[PDB]
Symmetry: C3
Subunit: 110 residues, 3 copies
């Protein structure tokens, strides 16, 4: 199991969501965040942090590469600021209503 955390442009949420759902994703969490990247000592009057959305998608390992490709293709515009993806390990997943775990708590297959 892995967590895919994708930081995207806010306007891209629905395009990314549709891509993910059509690829078989059946869960995801979205956070409002602000950030900076490489910015191709500070100011008291201006703000370097830009609004983004943080998508968190917990998947099985066999899904990761597909998910990444779907996100990148849907989120990209070609302009600096398109976002960044971080993949990290997940040890266990539990569905609260039922107590089901791992693939049972993630998968479209029940």
């Amino acid at each position: 199991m892995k967590k895919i955390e994708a930081i995207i442009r806010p306007f891209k949420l629905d395009e990314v969501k549709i891509a993910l759902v059509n690829a078989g994703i059946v869960g995801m969490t979205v956070s409002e965040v602000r950030g900076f990247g490489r910015q191709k000592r500070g100011s008291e009057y201006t703000v370097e942090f830009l609004q983004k959305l943080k998508l968190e998608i917990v998947v099985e390992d066999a899904q990761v590469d597909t998910v990444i490709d779907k996100i990148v293709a849907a989120a990209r515009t070609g302009e600096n600021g398109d976002g960044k993806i971080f993949v990290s390990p997940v040890d266990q997943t539990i569905r609260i209503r039922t107590g089901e775990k791992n693939a049972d708590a993630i998968s479209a297959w029940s």
Copy 2:
């Protein structure tokens, strides 16, 4: 050390908090998020993302199973949408005020 990330119904925060504190938890972070799960191509007029709270609780490994059980018991209602828990590894924890690490930065025992 592990991070327990629990996505719960907003109204359940205080019931879950009380359960955790009574089980000996002495730290946690809460985020406002939106999400979807299995939803037992999109719309321009309606919103599939539902408001939830993201609880992040960093614990020692011996605490994990207890914490999960306390969260599930307090958060559950039986209706779809009760939430989901993800456990992930933590390599190091540091308390900023003192520089203490790991168990010293987590534990109720000082």
Copy 3:
């Protein structure tokens, strides 16, 4: 690659940002959160969760100790509530605009 998650006092954002940028950091994400720590059964009228900012900084492993030290030095005040840092593994990083990975998606060196 590691994720450094630093929970800090809101007023400290710019001091911490400046320290990180001067140490060579060229990316970070900030979240509004609420939390509690050790609090040196609840109430219906009062709120134990305190506003904090969650900084997420994905770095290469050689940067971690420097980053931690910069954060702690900039964020500390000496009063309870100064914050907490969690370090966790990252398996892969992808820049959305270009598809670059790992160090190429993190580093100041291109």
